[PDB]
Amino acid sequence: AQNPNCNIMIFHPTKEEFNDFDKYIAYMESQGAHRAGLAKIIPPKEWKARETYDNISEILIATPLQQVASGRAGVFTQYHKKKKAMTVGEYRHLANSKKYQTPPHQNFEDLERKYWKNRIYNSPIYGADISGSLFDENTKQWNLGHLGTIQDLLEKECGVVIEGVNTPYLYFGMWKTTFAWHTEDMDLYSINYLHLGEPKTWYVVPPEHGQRLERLARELFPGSSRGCGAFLRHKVALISPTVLKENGIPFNRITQEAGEFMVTFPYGYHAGFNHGFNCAEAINFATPRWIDYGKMASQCSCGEARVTFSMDAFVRILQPERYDLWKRGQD
Numbered sequence: 001a002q003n004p005n006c007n008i009m010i011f012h013p014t015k016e017e018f019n020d021f022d023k024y025i026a027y028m029e030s031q032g033a034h035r036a037g038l039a040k041i042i043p044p045k046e047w048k049a050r051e052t053y054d055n056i057s058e059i060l061i062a063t064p065l066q067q068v069a070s071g072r073a074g075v076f077t078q079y080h081k082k083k084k085a086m087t088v089g090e091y092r093h094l095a096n097s098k099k100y101q102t103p104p105h106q107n108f109e110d111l112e113r114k115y116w117k118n119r120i121y122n123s124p125i126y127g128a129d130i131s132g133s134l135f136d137e138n139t140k141q142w143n144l145g146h147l148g149t150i151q152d153l154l155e156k157e158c159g160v161v162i163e164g165v166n167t168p169y170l171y172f173g174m175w176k177t178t179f180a181w182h183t184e185d186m187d188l189y190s191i192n193y194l195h196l197g198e199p200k201t202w203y204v205v206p207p208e209h210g211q212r213l214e215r216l217a218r219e220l221f222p223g224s225s226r227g228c229g230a231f232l233r234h235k236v237a238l239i240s241p242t243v244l245k246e247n248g249i250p251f252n253r254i255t256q257e258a259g260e261f262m263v264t265f266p267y268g269y270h271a272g273f274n275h276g277f278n279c280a281e282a283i284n285f286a287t288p289r290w291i292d293y294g295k296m297a298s299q300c301s302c303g304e305a306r307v308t309f310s311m312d313a314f315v316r317i318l319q320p321e322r323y324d325l326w327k328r329g330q331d
């Protein structure tokens with residue numbers, strides 16, 4: 001069995017290997033990359049996402065989100081307070097202001113310590129989930145706006161034709177902006193490209209051990225767990241690496257830098273934080289190996305998780321028994 005310790009693998013595809021996306025995901029899996037839940041892909045040196053970023057300040061962040069924490073430094077939840085619209089230019093200035101900028105630090109490790117120690121005492125502002133793309137239309141390889149769609153995958157594998165579309169989203173981050181512990185909708189894959197700016201630190205639990213994280217989360221957030229049997233779908237819970245180690249939860253960590261791709265694999269729980277102003281683009285995707293995960297994915301039916309239009313058909317086809325209850329939570 002490849003990668004039995006479930007380490008995060010890092011790949012360096014050649015320009016020839018970078019042509020066929022599906023093929024290279026399958027190659028990574030042949031090497032056991034999926035066992036980690038997360039892999040890093042460094043693009044060949046000849047590749048570029050676009051010519052320059054000199055022209056991005058006019059993008060609008062219609063609903064910036066202030067991430068307000070409650071709890072203790074290692075175990076907290078966050079809620080999103082909506083703020084008034086601002087341009088990327090305005091947001092980048094805010095990020096770099098004395099109130100929000102990255103503190104002096106020695107290295108990534110020192111900064112990680114400062115994050116876990118101090119995150120709860122501040123409320124950074126995140127420009128998340130902005131439909132759009134920063135890839136040049138002429139970038140042919142690993143262009144997140146030109147991937148094969150999940151609907152087409154399900155049609156190819158299962159023969160059914162369904163409605164829905166699949167497009168990428170932009171994320172503008174600053175110091176301490178946070179992604180809570182989650183798997184993707186319907187336990188899909190995700191791919192994330194860090195277009196510019198400061199790094200993003202990731203934590204991941206191997207898919208084969210996801211239920212261990214879920215058990216801990218029920219223990220740590222006991223009122224949340226009573227309200228909903230899939231409350232990690234709410235994307236509000238944070239658990240530090242120290243707490244995970246104390247409770248024996250297997251996990252790994254890695255820092256993504258500008259110009260690098262990360263792939264999350266089905267049912268790979270992940271969480272993390274941004275080091276300073278940055279812009280990432282991400283999109284969900286499927287492969288034939290995903291279908292069995294989609295069929296088993298948990299669902300939030302309490303009303304909180306509220307998701308895209310396209311998840312309907314996934315639930316309808318893959319999880320017909322659950323569909324009526326899940327849709328009640330959507331309506």
Ligand SMILES: O=C(O)CNC(=O)C(=O)O
Binds near residue numbers: 264270282
């Ligand atoms: O970049 C972020 O804030 C969070 N991204 C993801 O969870 C992802 O790409 O799956």
Ligand SMILES: [Mg+2]
Binds near residue numbers: 055056057058059
């Ligand atoms: Mg612009």
Ligand code: NI
Binds near residue numbers: 182183184190264270
């Ligand atoms: Ni994710």
Ligand SMILES: [Zn+2]
Binds near residue numbers: 228230231300301304
């Ligand atoms: Zn719920």
